[PDB]
Symmetry: C3
Subunit: 449 residues, 3 copies
Amino acid sequence: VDFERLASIGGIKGHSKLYKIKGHPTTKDIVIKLVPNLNNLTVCSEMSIDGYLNLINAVIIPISQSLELMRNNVKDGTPNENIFGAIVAGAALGIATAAQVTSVVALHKSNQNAAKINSLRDSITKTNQAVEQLSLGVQETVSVLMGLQDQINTNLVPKINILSCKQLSNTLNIMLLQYYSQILTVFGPNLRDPATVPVSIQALSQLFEGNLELLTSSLGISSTDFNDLLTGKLITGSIIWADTQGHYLILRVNIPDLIEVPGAVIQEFIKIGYNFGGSLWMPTIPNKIIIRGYHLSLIDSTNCIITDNSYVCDRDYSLPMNPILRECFEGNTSSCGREMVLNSYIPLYALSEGVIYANCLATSCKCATTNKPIVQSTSTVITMIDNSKCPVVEVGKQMISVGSYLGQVSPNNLTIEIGPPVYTEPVDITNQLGNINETLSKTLDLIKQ
Amino acid sequence: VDFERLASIGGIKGHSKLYKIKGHPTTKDIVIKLVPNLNNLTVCSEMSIDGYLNLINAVIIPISQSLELMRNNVKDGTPNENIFGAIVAGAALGIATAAQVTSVVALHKSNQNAAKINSLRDSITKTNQAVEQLSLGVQETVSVLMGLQDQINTNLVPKINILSCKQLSNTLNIMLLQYYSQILTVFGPNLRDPATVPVSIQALSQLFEGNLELLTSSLGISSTDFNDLLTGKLITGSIIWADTQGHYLILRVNIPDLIEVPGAVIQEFIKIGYNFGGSLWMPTIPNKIIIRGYHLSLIDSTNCIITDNSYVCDRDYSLPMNPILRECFEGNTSSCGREMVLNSYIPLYALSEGVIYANCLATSCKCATTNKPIVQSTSTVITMIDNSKCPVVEVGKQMISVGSYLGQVSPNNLTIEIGPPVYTEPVDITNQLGNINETLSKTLDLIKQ
Amino acid sequence: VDFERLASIGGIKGHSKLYKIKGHPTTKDIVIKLVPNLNNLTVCSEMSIDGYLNLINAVIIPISQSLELMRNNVKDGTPNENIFGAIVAGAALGIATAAQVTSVVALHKSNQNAAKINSLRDSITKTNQAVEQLSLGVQETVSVLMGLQDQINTNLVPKINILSCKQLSNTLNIMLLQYYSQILTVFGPNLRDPATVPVSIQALSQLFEGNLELLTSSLGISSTDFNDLLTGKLITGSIIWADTQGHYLILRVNIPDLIEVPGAVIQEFIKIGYNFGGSLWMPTIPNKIIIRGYHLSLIDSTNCIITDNSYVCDRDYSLPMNPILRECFEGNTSSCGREMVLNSYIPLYALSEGVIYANCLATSCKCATTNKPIVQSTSTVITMIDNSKCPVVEVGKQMISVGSYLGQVSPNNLTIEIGPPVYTEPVDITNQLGNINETLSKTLDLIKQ
Ligand SMILES: *[C@@H]1O[C@H](CO[C@@H]2O[C@@H](C)[C@@H](O)[C@@H](O)[C@@H]2O)[C@@H](O[C@@H]2O[C@H](CO)[C@@H](O[C@@H]3O[C@H](CO)[C@@H](O)[C@H](O)[C@@H]3O)[C@H](O)[C@H]2NC(C)=O)[C@H](O)[C@H]1NC(C)=O
Ligand SMILES: *[C@@H]1O[C@H](CO[C@@H]2O[C@@H](C)[C@@H](O)[C@@H](O)[C@@H]2O)[C@@H](O[C@@H]2O[C@H](CO)[C@@H](O[C@@H]3O[C@H](CO)[C@@H](O)[C@H](O)[C@@H]3O)[C@H](O)[C@H]2NC(C)=O)[C@H](O)[C@H]1NC(C)=O
Ligand SMILES: *[C@@H]1O[C@H](CO[C@@H]2O[C@@H](C)[C@@H](O)[C@@H](O)[C@@H]2O)[C@@H](O[C@@H]2O[C@H](CO)[C@@H](O[C@@H]3O[C@H](CO)[C@@H](O)[C@H](O)[C@@H]3O)[C@H](O)[C@H]2NC(C)=O)[C@H](O)[C@H]1NC(C)=O
Ligand SMILES: *[C@@H]1O[C@H](CO)[C@@H](O)[C@H](O)[C@H]1NC(C)=O
Ligand SMILES: *[C@@H]1O[C@H](CO)[C@@H](O)[C@H](O)[C@H]1NC(C)=O
Ligand SMILES: *[C@@H]1O[C@H](CO)[C@@H](O)[C@H](O)[C@H]1NC(C)=O
Ligand SMILES: *[C@@H]1O[C@H](CO)[C@@H](O)[C@H](O)[C@H]1NC(C)=O
Ligand SMILES: *[C@@H]1O[C@H](CO)[C@@H](O)[C@H](O)[C@H]1NC(C)=O
Ligand SMILES: *[C@@H]1O[C@H](CO)[C@@H](O)[C@H](O)[C@H]1NC(C)=O
Ligand SMILES: *[C@@H]1O[C@H](CO)[C@@H](O)[C@H](O)[C@H]1NC(C)=O
Ligand SMILES: *[C@@H]1O[C@H](CO)[C@@H](O)[C@H](O)[C@H]1NC(C)=O
Ligand SMILES: *[C@@H]1O[C@H](CO)[C@@H](O)[C@H](O)[C@H]1NC(C)=O
Ligand SMILES: *[C@@H]1O[C@H](CO)[C@@H](O)[C@H](O)[C@H]1NC(C)=O
Ligand SMILES: *[C@@H]1O[C@H](CO)[C@@H](O)[C@H](O)[C@H]1NC(C)=O
Ligand SMILES: *[C@H]1O[C@H](CO)[C@@H](O)[C@H](O)[C@H]1NC(C)=O
């Protein structure tokens, strides 16, 4: 890429940041209970828990049935001693994809640990606090949790005798209906196929009043640097057991790790408007260019957080680009398109290493040190301001200082090769393909002559 | 649609679902009280209600004057000779659509029931609980409802003498300001034209801590199956009255239904990457094809929820394709477009009726029962794998089992034909336009002579 | 623009509203403290504040360091003959934009007032109420506030001795993790550079349970008409100080004003389907047209709220419109394009000042004064209906009355030109990609002839 020619056409080189992709995740098993274990409220709680039980058993049972169905198709013990592993009975599958097979293999791998955690069902159902830990093994422990367990251990407990029992039953019914609305909201897409659908950690967090940090801390991840504090919205987890007896859900989550792709640097750009042909124009370039070993491609940070120093993505998002755009970035400013604007929010000046790139035709350019106006050149449109002209500069309204030097090439004396203009592209451009069509079927009429 | 040549072009036939959408327009009517009724707080409440009342008086009166204007835009009379009424006022609508006329007919249809509900205004204001059902007639009822009644019947009521009265007044002001912010949030677009704008049941439930099925069970809808349980976001409804003295809003909602359009089957597809020209490609076909008696249309599930077995839409969303797409799906794989990718997240193999469609040029394909590689034929690009080759297949890393049979013919032994790709960013269409600019007078240079 | 031919192609003139732009905002300074001042809880608080402080220091300290680092890059003083201008040291900026320069100038303006507010740090940290005021000067005041100060002044305070101190400590821990997650949620993009990123009042109010007009009333701005009730989602604020001692942020917010651009009228339109060629077609014209002294342009309401009488935007969003669309709106219905629709939710009739535009080919049309049907003319598709034919009209299933007159000339008796249909696919481009290439040999063939 040539920054001098692309600055001649009106694009200024922005920051350079890194690219990091999530990769190599380890697994951790969590358990979530659903039944609010009340021990203090055995005086006045009545039958009303069983209505909540009937409403949650409408969704606990079919998820568990599909979960035991999907783990039933796979088997182990490949024929021959040389070949061994998990075998998917694809005749019993019907239609399946690669990630579904991978999830089936993962569930078959975690079936033994699911049975190991299922051995502690009475330990799961005996908890009376919000979040606590129980000894899974000699070195492993579980992370049982309920957000609403605290709500009938710090709010509804002290009103055990001041307030009437039917009012406690009605308030518990309102809270249970609201919580069942929350579980109904979060396990929406999970109802179709609860094996191949990951669970967002924030969607888990709205079950517990939107506290993602409690799940992050009790899960074990402790973000310390600046880069991992923004990260935490990409933690994925899958359900491995859906037990109906204690009415609990055993899930397996993936602890992320931000690996770094070698040699890939994300380069940003700033687009300014320039006055050509009596109109204001902007070059048509993408904002972000990934560069890796003299190779230009495209990415999208639609799902990626952007730090001050790097681009952090959940997964690699490499998109191809047109070779005409590659020639536009490399040498050919004639191959770069331009669009027109007339709105008031167009930047005309910007700073780059102490060098001002400014359109002086619309912006007032002056030097404070000499008190003389600066005129637009006719060989260029974008006008540079450095310490060669004047140190202390009047641009627009503002006093500024400049610094450094162009380095290699001055685009003031360089020729101008602004390419063809493009228009706006709504469904209007399909109507211009329509009048291109009538021009072409005029030429088809002129073919026969 | 032929699935063998569509498997040759790179598409795999996915699941088949239904289009059981829309239903009978049975309705129901409820009452939304705004001012909460305090009865235990007659000791220490001051006149903190007056600021809330002055805040809501700026809201309630415009909807009331708009609705009485809208009733002034219609009469019935008995003009003509066969017509016994239901005429609209001439030119009093100004600018109006068909849905506005339908809303006019709806208010003229329900004004008698609105007067019937308004006959018990003193019965409306005497409620001191959250949700009540009061008898409209002999076998009829409505639902008067106040979700913040509980918060000043279980939280602010017991602190009547423990906490100081000015602190209760301040906290009451805080929750009144918060709840008035909630009404200002939910009746945002409703303030412009409060007769033709429906009300989302989820945004209505957001006034009540997001307890949707509390409103649903108080309404009367009891979804019992899997398909209708996810449904409940298609309730909707329109306000029929905005009474100022009781400060309440009489709402009319529609009880939905799920009828089935006959013969319409939604078909899913899986698009895999194939290695042609030393490059990775995918075919360009839409994901869902609706088929009804040899008729292909297009749909968009931008709002429709997807069940495990069918598609639930609020309303029919039929779209067409080009006839070139119809020939692409029927017989012409040369008319099916393609796209080039280089990203890592491209699946290359999938399963369909125990038959593997695999890109073995990039995927390791072996038979574990015989320990031999599976090689790509030069005639095919996508490899069919069944039990005729080998029962246990190594694909990728995984042991899998195949089964069933082929189905008519195979896609491997068929001829393959392909076409050019194209993308967005119409600067290439701009160069094509300049090509037309030079081309049309490239024609009229040396035709004759 | 005409409305006779434009309704003859099927577009009906909607309401005419105004255009207003937010302009000239003044500045007011607020302060936001973050450490919850507990005074009643000195009996049982333990050291749970220390973990919250350790969590929030990693956010507070680098924001303050970046703020003072950006503060160092601007200097004042006289550049020889010029008096002042706040000279920006451009060597200490790297790459900067115009908005960043304006923000640096804003903080250079606000350093003195930030120091004046920072002189009352012990006054800031001593507040034990939710929202209260302190005297900044003889005529200026500050607006120190918390949404969660009340929560440990009305909820956790009365359970000082009834509930155990470790349960109070755990409840405070859970609520502090939840609120620390709230600050991590709202200050997401602010951590990259906390000077150039504006702060929305909505996400700020999300820290205080979504009570927007509590913040608005503490600011002092008050809405009084219909147009300012919907306005309230566009308040812009910027960080001016990030003090780590009392752990508070001094913020400067911009109280706005809705200025009116003169002569600009936003025109809406209603597009109906018309039956041509045995099929339903939809004309392709934009819904909104801004007209200002015979000047058509394009706008987008992607962020602008729409009131009953005007358009309220955060900033001007004028876009150029095509000269082919200028011929479409002025004279040439051939330039007005079309598309082919088949879905059932297409309106075919509408009312405009007692003028019925009705496609009577698909809609039943009658006059029950005479009890006869109304037929379709061959010279037009859209049916003109006024009181000259019959004053009381039957359209579809609805019985209406009309008035007024035609409007200059009737839109039924003329003949209008037509545009071609379009689609939403790049297939056409690929067609031409080889088409013009094939027709190129044909052009030379004409030359050969
Ligand atoms: C999940 O897998 C289990 C285990 O069965 C094994 O896997 C199947 C896929 C087949 O390949 C089996 O041959 C294989 O053993 C299946 O559970 C089994 O279900 C059957 C009924 O389908 C049960 O038989 C019943 O048993 C008693 C006998 O007294 C009577 O009630 C009935 O007469 C009937 O025969 C059987 O006990 C049960 N268990 C075992 C170990 O075979 C299961 O069908 C399968 N699928 C699902 C969806 O759960
Ligand atoms: C909505 O409609 C009511 C009812 O009036 C009926 O509908 C109107 C659209 C017109 O077609 C009327 O002719 C028709 O009766 C309107 O309320 C009426 O408003 C008028 C004033 O516009 C009232 O007249 C006043 O009455 C007393 C007489 O002592 C004095 O205060 C005034 O001198 C004045 O004459 C009238 O009483 C009232 N009611 C009726 C039954 O006619 C209403 O104006 C209309 N529009 C709106 C915007 O509310
Ligand atoms: C922000 O600015 C302050 C003020 O410094 C002034 O502005 C800077 C932008 C430069 O132009 C300075 O020349 C100018 O004075 C900076 O504080 C200063 O930091 C320096 C170190 O960077 C301190 O020097 C130290 O001082 C003592 C001397 O006994 C010893 O510890 C060291 O040997 C060392 O020399 C200096 O005292 C201090 N104050 C002043 C008034 O200069 C500050 O660093 C700067 N930037 C940031 C990121 O905070
Ligand atoms: C409440 O429950 C706790 C925990 O089980 C127990 O220690 C306490 O004694 C109970 N109190 C009453 C009054 O039941
Ligand atoms: C593009 O640039 C190359 C050198 O980088 C040059 O040879 C070529 O002619 C240019 N093409 C244009 C300006 O169209
Ligand atoms: C640009 O070229 C001019 C002559 O046109 C020359 O005076 C000037 O020094 C050049 N600038 C450079 C090489 O930076
Ligand atoms: C293109 O033009 C031809 C000839 O006028 C017309 O028949 C055809 O429908 C048009 N096609 C498209 C896709 O615009
Ligand atoms: C509180 O209100 C309820 C319901 O109206 C009533 O039964 C009760 O007596 C009231 N209590 C007091 C102390 O006013
Ligand atoms: C595929 O075609 C080949 C010849 O090209 C033939 O030998 C083979 O039997 C065919 N397989 C089918 C029809 O399944
Ligand atoms: C290209 O330009 C104009 C429109 O700008 C068009 O009318 C003309 O036919 C085209 N060709 C030439 C040779 O100008
Ligand atoms: C609680 O704090 C308030 C306000 O500072 C004070 O008036 C009151 O005495 C305190 N009460 C106790 C029990 O400490
Ligand atoms: C466009 O309209 C003008 C008058 O406004 C007319 O002279 C001209 O012929 C029209 N052009 C068409 C229909 O192509
Ligand atoms: C429409 O044209 C007819 C002649 O075809 C004429 O009689 C009639 O008055 C016209 N209507 C107008 C101009 O409104
Ligand atoms: C059409 O011709 C142009 C110019 O030679 C070429 O760039 C383009 O690839 C061709 N398109 C096809 C599909 O052959
Ligand atoms: C497919 O069949 C159609 C006729 O139905 C034909 O026009 C097309 O060329 C065929 N596909 C080929 C040979 O590319």
